[model samples]
Target: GKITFYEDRGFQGHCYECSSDCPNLQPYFSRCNSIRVDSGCWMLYERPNYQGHQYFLRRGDYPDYQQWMGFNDSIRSCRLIPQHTGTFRMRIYERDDFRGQMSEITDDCPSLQDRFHLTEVHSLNVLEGSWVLYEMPSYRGRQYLLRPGEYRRYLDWGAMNAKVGSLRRVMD
Candidate 1:
C-alpha cells in the first residue's frame, strides 16, 4: 500500500496554533518556529558629580594619548580642574580600543566601586588632585590624558542633583 500527505487549503505557515478541528480523522502535520534578535545598544542619562564638575576631553587635548589608556585614570585625572564644574549628558559609543559602549543616560550615577568594576577595558586608579592613571593589567602601561572642557550636552534635573559619594557613605 502507498500513503499520501495533504495540507489544508487555508493553513498559515507562520501561525503558532492550527485550526480548532481538522477535516481528516488521521493525524495532521504542522511546522512552527520562533526567533529573537536584539540591536545591542544602551542609554546613559544625567549623573551628578559631588565636586560639581563634568569634563570631556577632545583629541587635541592630549597629543600623545594612546589607545590603551582607560577613561577613568588617564583622561579623567588630568583635566579635572576645580574651576571647571558643571553637568551634562551624552551617549557613549562602543570602541574596539575598549569594551562595548554604555547607553541610556539616567538621573543616577553608579557607586565608585561599581563604576570601576563595570568598566570593560582596563583598570583605573585615582591619583592626586583628580588625576587618573590607566592601569592595564596585561601590558602594565599608563597614560595621563587630561579633560579640558565641560561635557558637550545637557543633563536632566535628576542627574544634575545626584551626587557621587567619597569618604562617607551617601544615600542613593
Candidate 2:
C-alpha cells in the first residue's frame, strides 16, 4: 500500500513569486507542492528560513492521498480490514533536485506480531501518526484477514486497542 500526503487549508496563501497558492509554486522550485498531494486535509504552517526564504511546515500527518486523490468530482467510499492493523513510521526529506521525498516508513514488528493472536477491534493511537494497532497481544488459530468495511475516519492505535478485550472475549 502507498500513502498520499496533504496539508490543511491555511497553506493556500498567495506566494509573492507566483499569484497562485504556495503549493502551486512549490513544484517550480522542485519541491513537493501541497496542491499535488491533496487539498486542505492536513495542516501546514509557514516558517522562516535562512536568507529570508519562507517555507511551509508540515504540522500533521498527511491525508491518505492514494485513497482520496481520484475523487475529483465527489467524495468516495472506503473499506476497512483486519490487515490494516500495526504501527507505521514515516519520514520526509527534501530532494537535492528540489523535490520532496517520504521514506524510512516502517511498521513496528511487535505491533504486527500482536495481529497473530489479537483482532484489531479499534485503533488506540498512531505512533507519529503512522504506526497503528494498539492492543495487547493474543494468539490466533489462523492468520487474520481484513474484511471490507469503510473506516469512516482515520483509525488511531488507541481507538483500535480500545476494543481488544471485548473482541478477545468473542474470539476466545
User: How well is each residue in 123-158 modelled by candidate 1, as lDDT tens digits?
Assistant: 111211122112232222332221222222213211
Estimated TM-score per prediction? 0.20, 0.18
Task: Give Cα distance to truth, residue 44, candidate 2, Å.
Answer: 18
- Write down the TM-score for model 2: 0.18
1-172, model 2: which lDDT tens digit per residue? 1112233222333212222223332333322223332212121212111111111212133223222222121111111111223433333122322134323324333333343343333222122332222133432211111122222222321132233221111010
lDDT of 2 at 74: 16
Tell me the deviation in Å of residue 105 in model 2.
11
Alpha carbon lDDT of residue 169, candidate 1?
Answer: 10
Q: Which stretches of model 2 miss by more than 4 angstroms? A: 1-73, 76-114, 131-172
